[PDB]
Amino acid sequence: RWTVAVYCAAAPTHPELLELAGAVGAAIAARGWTLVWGGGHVSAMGAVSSAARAHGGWTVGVIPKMLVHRELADHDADELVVTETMWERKQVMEDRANAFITLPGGVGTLDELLDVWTEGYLGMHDKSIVVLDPWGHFDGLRAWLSELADTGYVSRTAMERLIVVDNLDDALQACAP
Template sequence: MNICVFCASSLHIDKKYIELAGQVGAELAKRGHTLVSGGATVSCMGAVTSAARAGGGRTIGVIPQVLVDIEVADEGSDELIVTTDMRERKGLMDARSDAFLVLPGGIGTLEELFEIWTARVLGIHDRPLVVLDPWGLYGPLKQLMSHLYDEGFTRAEVFDAISWTTTVDEAFAHLESRSQPVRPSIAELGESTR
Protein backbone atom coordinates (compact mmCIF):
# COMPACT_ATOMS: atom_id res chain seq x y z
CA MET A 1 0.00 0.00 0.00
CA ASN A 2 0.93 3.65 -0.34
CA ILE A 3 0.54 4.91 3.22
CA CYS A 4 0.34 8.65 3.79
CA VAL A 5 1.81 9.69 7.14
CA PHE A 6 0.76 13.05 8.55
CA CYS A 7 3.09 14.27 11.31
CA ALA A 8 4.95 17.21 12.81
CA SER A 9 7.60 19.32 11.17
CA SER A 10 8.15 21.35 14.36
CA LEU A 11 11.69 21.49 15.72
CA HIS A 12 10.64 22.19 19.31
CA ILE A 13 9.07 18.91 20.41
CA ASP A 14 10.08 16.08 22.73
CA LYS A 15 12.38 13.61 21.01
CA LYS A 16 9.96 10.77 21.85
CA TYR A 17 7.73 12.00 19.00
CA ILE A 18 10.63 11.94 16.55
CA GLU A 19 11.59 8.44 17.74
CA LEU A 20 7.99 7.29 17.20
CA ALA A 21 8.09 8.63 13.64
CA GLY A 22 11.31 6.67 13.07
CA GLN A 23 9.67 3.50 14.36
CA VAL A 24 6.74 4.05 11.99
CA GLY A 25 9.05 4.56 9.01
CA ALA A 26 11.03 1.41 9.82
CA GLU A 27 7.87 -0.67 10.26
CA LEU A 28 6.37 0.68 7.05
CA ALA A 29 9.46 -0.41 5.10
CA LYS A 30 9.61 -3.78 6.87
CA ARG A 31 6.03 -4.49 5.77
CA GLY A 32 6.78 -3.52 2.17
CA HIS A 33 4.68 -0.36 1.96
CA THR A 34 5.47 2.93 0.21
CA LEU A 35 5.55 6.13 2.26
CA VAL A 36 3.74 9.24 1.08
CA SER A 37 4.90 12.22 3.14
CA GLY A 38 5.01 16.01 3.19
CA GLY A 39 8.41 15.96 1.51
CA ALA A 40 10.52 17.68 4.19
CA THR A 41 13.62 16.50 6.06
CA VAL A 42 12.92 18.08 9.45
CA SER A 43 11.47 16.76 12.71
CA CYS A 44 9.03 13.83 12.56
CA MET A 45 8.59 14.18 8.82
CA GLY A 46 12.31 13.70 8.29
CA ALA A 47 12.50 10.85 10.79
CA VAL A 48 9.72 8.80 9.22
CA THR A 49 11.18 9.27 5.74
CA SER A 50 14.78 8.52 6.74
CA ALA A 51 13.77 5.37 8.60
CA ALA A 52 11.60 4.15 5.73
CA ARG A 53 14.44 4.60 3.25
CA ALA A 54 16.99 3.03 5.61
CA GLY A 55 14.73 -0.03 5.73
CA GLY A 56 14.57 -0.25 1.94
CA GLY A 57 11.17 1.40 1.61
CA ARG A 58 10.08 3.60 -1.28
CA THR A 59 9.28 7.24 -0.45
CA ILE A 60 7.15 9.83 -2.21
CA GLY A 61 7.47 13.40 -0.93
CA VAL A 62 5.02 16.17 -1.80
CA ILE A 63 6.00 19.70 -0.81
CA PRO A 64 4.84 23.15 -1.91
CA GLN A 65 7.45 25.54 -3.31
CA VAL A 66 6.88 27.96 -0.40
CA LEU A 67 8.09 25.28 2.04
CA VAL A 68 11.06 24.08 0.02
CA ASP A 69 13.19 26.92 1.41
CA ILE A 70 11.73 26.74 4.95
CA GLU A 71 11.67 23.00 5.65
CA VAL A 72 14.44 21.71 3.36
CA ALA A 73 12.97 19.46 0.69
CA ASP A 74 13.75 15.76 0.87
CA GLU A 75 15.90 15.47 -2.24
CA GLY A 76 16.55 11.81 -1.36
CA SER A 77 12.93 10.82 -2.03
CA ASP A 78 12.37 8.24 -4.73
CA GLU A 79 9.85 10.74 -6.04
CA LEU A 80 9.77 14.38 -4.92
CA ILE A 81 6.84 16.45 -6.16
CA VAL A 82 6.99 20.24 -5.71
CA THR A 83 3.54 21.84 -5.84
CA THR A 84 2.43 25.42 -6.25
CA ASP A 85 0.54 25.56 -2.94
CA MET A 86 -0.69 23.65 0.12
CA ARG A 87 -4.02 22.70 -1.44
CA GLU A 88 -2.34 21.06 -4.39
CA ARG A 89 0.03 19.30 -1.98
CA LYS A 90 -2.81 17.81 0.07
CA GLY A 91 -4.71 16.82 -3.06
CA LEU A 92 -1.73 14.94 -4.47
CA MET A 93 -0.95 13.28 -1.14
CA ASP A 94 -4.58 12.15 -0.98
CA ALA A 95 -4.62 10.93 -4.58
CA ARG A 96 -1.40 8.93 -4.16
CA SER A 97 -2.47 7.18 -0.91
CA ASP A 98 -4.29 3.95 -0.10
CA ALA A 99 -4.42 4.66 3.65
CA PHE A 100 -3.69 7.45 6.12
CA LEU A 101 -1.73 7.34 9.38
CA VAL A 102 -1.74 10.37 11.66
CA LEU A 103 1.03 10.82 14.24
CA PRO A 104 1.20 13.50 16.92
CA GLY A 105 1.46 16.94 15.36
CA GLY A 106 0.30 20.55 15.39
CA ILE A 107 -2.24 22.58 13.45
CA GLY A 108 -0.95 21.45 10.05
CA THR A 109 -1.35 17.82 11.05
CA LEU A 110 -4.81 18.56 12.45
CA GLU A 111 -5.82 20.27 9.20
CA GLU A 112 -4.75 17.20 7.23
CA LEU A 113 -6.51 14.87 9.68
CA PHE A 114 -9.78 16.80 9.52
CA GLU A 115 -9.80 16.97 5.73
CA ILE A 116 -9.33 13.21 5.31
CA TRP A 117 -11.68 12.46 8.23
CA THR A 118 -14.44 14.68 6.83
CA ALA A 119 -14.12 13.12 3.38
CA ARG A 120 -14.45 9.66 4.89
CA VAL A 121 -17.51 10.62 6.95
CA LEU A 122 -19.12 12.04 3.80
CA GLY A 123 -18.41 8.82 1.90
CA ILE A 124 -15.99 10.45 -0.54
CA HIS A 125 -13.50 7.69 0.22
CA ASP A 126 -13.40 4.51 2.33
CA ARG A 127 -9.65 4.25 2.86
CA PRO A 128 -8.39 3.48 6.37
CA LEU A 129 -7.72 6.47 8.63
CA VAL A 130 -5.69 5.62 11.72
CA VAL A 131 -4.35 7.83 14.50
CA LEU A 132 -1.29 6.60 16.42
CA ASP A 133 -1.28 8.36 19.79
CA PRO A 134 0.78 6.54 22.46
CA TRP A 135 0.79 9.43 24.94
CA GLY A 136 -2.78 10.73 24.64
CA LEU A 137 -1.98 14.01 22.88
CA TYR A 138 -5.28 13.77 21.00
CA GLY A 139 -7.35 12.87 24.08
CA PRO A 140 -8.92 16.35 24.24
CA LEU A 141 -9.79 16.08 20.53
CA LYS A 142 -11.63 12.81 21.15
CA GLN A 143 -13.52 14.47 24.00
CA LEU A 144 -14.38 17.44 21.78
CA MET A 145 -15.76 15.12 19.10
CA SER A 146 -17.89 13.37 21.70
CA HIS A 147 -19.17 16.74 22.93
CA LEU A 148 -19.95 17.86 19.36
CA TYR A 149 -21.88 14.62 18.88
CA ASP A 150 -23.82 15.12 22.12
CA GLU A 151 -24.73 18.63 20.95
CA GLY A 152 -25.94 17.36 17.58
CA PHE A 153 -23.16 18.82 15.43
CA THR A 154 -21.87 15.46 14.18
CA ARG A 155 -23.30 12.05 13.39
CA ALA A 156 -22.25 8.63 14.66
CA GLU A 157 -20.30 8.06 11.42
CA VAL A 158 -17.65 10.44 12.72
CA PHE A 159 -16.58 7.73 15.18
CA ASP A 160 -16.81 4.91 12.64
CA ALA A 161 -14.55 6.69 10.15
CA ILE A 162 -11.39 6.63 12.28
CA SER A 163 -9.33 4.21 14.37
CA TRP A 164 -7.45 5.37 17.46
CA THR A 165 -4.37 3.32 18.33
CA THR A 166 -1.53 3.47 20.84
CA THR A 167 1.15 1.17 19.37
CA VAL A 168 2.89 0.91 16.03
CA ASP A 169 1.79 -2.72 15.60
CA GLU A 170 -1.82 -1.86 16.37
CA ALA A 171 -1.75 1.05 13.91
CA PHE A 172 -0.45 -1.13 11.07
CA ALA A 173 -2.92 -3.88 11.90
CA HIS A 174 -5.75 -1.37 11.37
CA LEU A 175 -4.20 0.03 8.20
CA GLU A 176 -3.67 -3.40 6.68
CA SER A 177 -6.97 -4.97 7.71
CA ARG A 178 -9.01 -2.35 5.85
CA SER A 179 -11.77 -3.30 8.27
CA GLN A 180 -14.27 -0.85 9.65
CA PRO A 181 -12.88 1.03 12.65
CA VAL A 182 -14.48 0.43 16.02
CA ARG A 183 -16.14 3.32 17.82
CA PRO A 184 -14.17 4.30 20.95
CA SER A 185 -15.68 3.24 24.26
CA ILE A 186 -17.23 5.82 26.56
CA ALA A 187 -14.24 5.43 28.89
CA GLU A 188 -11.84 6.18 26.00
CA LEU A 189 -13.78 9.28 25.06
CA GLY A 190 -13.97 10.58 28.60
CA GLU A 191 -17.59 11.67 28.09
CA SER A 192 -20.87 9.95 27.40
CA THR A 193 -22.12 9.53 23.87
CA ARG A 194 -25.56 8.85 22.47
Protein backbone atom coordinates in the same frame (compact mmCIF):
# COMPACT_ATOMS: atom_id res chain seq x y z
CA ARG B 1 1.89 -0.94 -4.52
CA TRP B 2 0.32 -0.50 -1.02
CA THR B 3 0.95 3.05 0.13
CA VAL B 4 0.59 4.63 3.54
CA ALA B 5 0.72 8.34 4.21
CA VAL B 6 2.03 9.49 7.55
CA TYR B 7 1.07 12.98 8.75
CA CYS B 8 3.20 14.32 11.63
CA ALA B 9 4.90 17.36 13.16
CA ALA B 10 7.16 19.65 11.13
CA ALA B 11 8.29 22.02 13.90
CA PRO B 12 9.43 20.54 17.24
CA THR B 13 11.81 17.82 18.30
CA HIS B 14 10.75 16.01 21.43
CA PRO B 15 12.83 12.80 21.20
CA GLU B 16 9.83 10.56 22.04
CA LEU B 17 8.05 11.82 18.93
CA LEU B 18 11.10 11.40 16.65
CA GLU B 19 11.39 7.88 18.09
CA LEU B 20 7.78 7.08 17.29
CA ALA B 21 8.11 8.54 13.78
CA GLY B 22 11.29 6.57 13.07
CA ALA B 23 9.67 3.38 14.32
CA VAL B 24 6.65 4.14 12.15
CA GLY B 25 8.76 4.64 9.00
CA ALA B 26 10.79 1.46 9.53
CA ALA B 27 7.68 -0.67 10.13
CA ILE B 28 6.03 0.62 6.94
CA ALA B 29 9.19 -0.12 4.93
CA ALA B 30 9.36 -3.71 6.25
CA ARG B 31 5.98 -4.64 4.81
CA GLY B 32 7.03 -3.60 1.29
CA TRP B 33 4.73 -0.58 1.68
CA THR B 34 5.45 2.82 0.20
CA LEU B 35 5.64 5.92 2.41
CA VAL B 36 3.87 9.10 1.34
CA TRP B 37 4.58 12.10 3.55
CA GLY B 38 4.86 15.92 3.37
CA GLY B 39 8.31 15.67 1.75
CA GLY B 40 10.25 17.64 4.36
CA HIS B 41 13.37 16.67 6.27
CA VAL B 42 12.38 18.78 9.32
CA SER B 43 11.33 17.14 12.57
CA ALA B 44 9.00 14.12 12.68
CA MET B 45 8.67 14.34 8.88
CA GLY B 46 12.43 13.74 8.59
CA ALA B 47 12.37 10.98 11.21
CA VAL B 48 9.63 8.97 9.43
CA SER B 49 10.98 9.38 5.89
CA SER B 50 14.70 8.96 6.53
CA ALA B 51 13.90 5.91 8.70
CA ALA B 52 11.71 4.41 5.94
CA ARG B 53 14.47 5.02 3.40
CA ALA B 54 17.23 3.52 5.56
CA HIS B 55 15.04 0.46 6.15
CA GLY B 56 14.59 -0.20 2.41
CA GLY B 57 11.20 1.34 1.54
CA TRP B 58 10.03 3.63 -1.26
CA THR B 59 9.39 7.22 -0.04
CA VAL B 60 7.19 9.78 -1.80
CA GLY B 61 7.39 13.39 -0.67
CA VAL B 62 4.69 15.94 -1.42
CA ILE B 63 5.46 19.57 -0.51
CA PRO B 64 4.18 23.01 -1.58
CA LYS B 65 6.59 25.25 -3.53
CA MET B 66 6.12 27.90 -0.83
CA LEU B 67 7.25 25.48 1.93
CA VAL B 68 10.39 24.04 0.19
CA HIS B 69 12.88 26.01 2.34
CA ARG B 70 11.03 26.16 5.63
CA GLU B 71 10.44 22.44 5.87
CA LEU B 72 13.58 21.39 3.96
CA ALA B 73 12.38 19.58 0.81
CA ASP B 74 13.80 16.07 0.76
CA HIS B 75 15.56 15.63 -2.59
CA ASP B 76 16.54 12.18 -1.32
CA ALA B 77 12.97 10.89 -1.63
CA ASP B 78 12.53 8.29 -4.34
CA GLU B 79 10.06 10.66 -5.89
CA LEU B 80 9.51 14.24 -4.81
CA VAL B 81 6.53 16.29 -5.95
CA VAL B 82 6.52 20.08 -5.55
CA THR B 83 2.94 21.37 -5.77
CA GLU B 84 2.06 24.94 -6.77
CA THR B 85 -0.40 25.32 -3.84
CA MET B 86 -0.98 24.11 -0.25
CA TRP B 87 -4.29 22.59 -1.26
CA GLU B 88 -2.74 20.47 -4.07
CA ARG B 89 -0.34 18.82 -1.62
CA LYS B 90 -3.18 17.31 0.38
CA GLN B 91 -5.00 16.27 -2.81
CA VAL B 92 -1.91 14.55 -4.23
CA MET B 93 -1.09 12.88 -0.89
CA GLU B 94 -4.64 11.56 -0.41
CA ASP B 95 -4.83 10.18 -3.97
CA ARG B 96 -1.53 8.25 -3.85
CA ALA B 97 -2.20 6.81 -0.39
CA ASN B 98 -4.23 3.69 0.45
CA ALA B 99 -4.28 4.37 4.19
CA PHE B 100 -3.36 7.18 6.57
CA ILE B 101 -1.49 7.29 9.87
CA THR B 102 -1.51 10.48 11.96
CA LEU B 103 1.02 10.96 14.77
CA PRO B 104 1.27 13.74 17.37
CA GLY B 105 1.62 17.19 15.84
CA GLY B 106 -0.04 20.61 15.88
CA VAL B 107 -2.21 22.71 13.57
CA GLY B 108 -0.62 21.50 10.35
CA THR B 109 -0.96 17.85 11.21
CA LEU B 110 -4.57 18.43 12.33
CA ASP B 111 -5.45 20.24 9.10
CA GLU B 112 -4.06 17.38 7.06
CA LEU B 113 -6.04 14.96 9.25
CA LEU B 114 -9.20 17.05 8.81
CA ASP B 115 -8.78 17.22 5.03
CA VAL B 116 -8.77 13.38 4.66
CA TRP B 117 -11.38 12.75 7.37
CA THR B 118 -13.81 15.18 5.71
CA GLU B 119 -13.37 13.61 2.30
CA GLY B 120 -13.78 10.22 3.99
CA TYR B 121 -16.98 11.10 5.90
CA LEU B 122 -18.47 12.85 2.86
CA GLY B 123 -17.86 9.42 1.25
CA MET B 124 -15.35 10.58 -1.36
CA HIS B 125 -12.98 7.64 -0.57
CA ASP B 126 -12.87 4.25 1.17
CA LYS B 127 -9.43 4.50 2.84
CA SER B 128 -8.60 3.63 6.46
CA ILE B 129 -7.77 6.69 8.62
CA VAL B 130 -5.64 5.89 11.67
CA VAL B 131 -4.44 8.01 14.62
CA LEU B 132 -1.48 6.63 16.61
CA ASP B 133 -1.38 8.19 20.06
CA PRO B 134 0.61 6.23 22.70
CA TRP B 135 0.63 8.93 25.40
CA GLY B 136 -2.67 10.77 24.89
CA HIS B 137 -1.43 13.75 22.85
CA PHE B 138 -4.92 13.85 21.24
CA ASP B 139 -6.89 13.24 24.46
CA GLY B 140 -8.05 16.88 24.65
CA LEU B 141 -9.13 16.91 21.01
CA ARG B 142 -11.07 13.66 21.32
CA ALA B 143 -12.83 14.71 24.51
CA TRP B 144 -13.97 17.74 22.49
CA LEU B 145 -15.04 15.81 19.37
CA SER B 146 -17.11 13.52 21.63
CA GLU B 147 -19.02 16.54 23.06
CA LEU B 148 -19.77 17.63 19.49
CA ALA B 149 -20.95 14.11 18.66
CA ASP B 150 -23.16 14.00 21.76
CA THR B 151 -24.54 17.51 20.96
CA GLY B 152 -25.19 16.71 17.26
CA TYR B 153 -22.40 18.65 15.50
CA VAL B 154 -20.51 15.55 14.24
CA SER B 155 -22.38 12.41 13.12
CA ARG B 156 -21.90 8.86 14.47
CA THR B 157 -20.63 7.53 11.08
CA ALA B 158 -18.09 10.36 11.15
CA MET B 159 -16.59 9.47 14.53
CA GLU B 160 -16.47 5.75 13.53
CA ARG B 161 -14.40 6.80 10.50
CA LEU B 162 -11.46 7.63 12.86
CA ILE B 163 -9.50 4.62 14.17
CA VAL B 164 -7.49 5.85 17.19
CA VAL B 165 -4.94 3.41 18.65
CA ASP B 166 -2.20 3.49 21.29
CA ASN B 167 0.30 1.04 19.74
CA LEU B 168 2.20 0.70 16.45
CA ASP B 169 1.11 -2.97 16.04
CA ASP B 170 -2.59 -1.98 15.84
CA ALA B 171 -2.00 1.06 13.61
CA LEU B 172 -0.30 -1.18 11.04
CA GLN B 173 -3.02 -3.84 11.33
CA ALA B 174 -5.67 -1.13 10.84
CA CYS B 175 -3.71 0.11 7.80
CA ALA B 176 -3.19 -3.26 6.04
CA PRO B 177 -4.87 -4.10 2.67
